[PDB]
């Protein structure tokens, strides 16, 4: 089997992407944030504290003839940005782009933190990291990909995120028309539950490539590119007036700037992030100070190849017995 679904930016800045997902019978379609950095499929629901729902579409398990309470199961998750959610668990039929999993754990939110409430466009998350990170207790549950994998034509999914435009998540096949040149595959460590890999270096603009190992995670659920302070300083030093602001929370730059590109290495291959991908616009409405899309990972404890990086590539998440990651230009 295969599946193919379009993923759409939630706003004009590509702060996140949403992908429609069919849950239950008859189908209830919710727009979920596909997140290769976590491993829970959770939704706003009829059980979510009413004051914490503000415009999201909810899953109502009582209206699904295939929903079954997973007795005694609870879940609770906290994300890197400080947001969180928790609740109980149903199993139900879940389909993405024509690919159907029966008995998928659908984690129903009883509580969500303010950032979730405040974002009306995201109805929940669909985790695509390794199932070892799943938070369901006392019986850990599998991700949608893990459940689908054996049925897929090939045990892979691909992320093809757009810059200020829709893109595609495919399951079970590689669309050879979706990228240019060849796909370069690179080793993955699953030890921390992530799609963790080591970039071979970077360049800023037309500058020379610096060969240096940068361990980090391919994370579709993180907006920005978080890299070591040395790398980030080298990038922003090429932008007149750019500075790190502790009050704002990162590097900012004059909105009048033209940003240089940023290149990262994948083995001997190179992925070029155009300068415009690194512009996240004014820090506050009407400001001429703009927020940068490359930020320091210092104090995160891990480097994160988020959407800023991934949207410059066609990315293969290869879930074979020994997982790997592939990157192609597009």
From Swiss-Prot:
Q: The Peptidase A1 domain covers which part of the protein?
A: 17-328
Record GO terms (molecular function): aspartic-type endopeptidase activity
**Gene Ontology biological process terms from the UniProt entry:** proteolysis
**What are the annotated disulfide bridges?**
255-290
**Reactions listed under catalytic activity:** Hydrolysis of proteins with specificity similar to that of pepsin A, prefers hydrophobic residues at P1 and P1', but does not cleave 14-Ala-|-Leu-15 in the B chain of insulin or Z-Glu-Tyr. Clots milk
**Principal EC category:** hydrolase
Query: Per the similarity annotation, which family is this?
Result: Belongs to the peptidase A1 family.
Protein name listed in UniProt: Endothiapepsin
Species of the source: Cryphonectria parasitica (Chestnut blight fungus)
Question: Lineage of this protein's species?
Answer: Eukaryota, Fungi, Dikarya, Ascomycota, Pezizomycotina
Q: Which residues of the full protein are shown?
A: 90 to 419 of 419
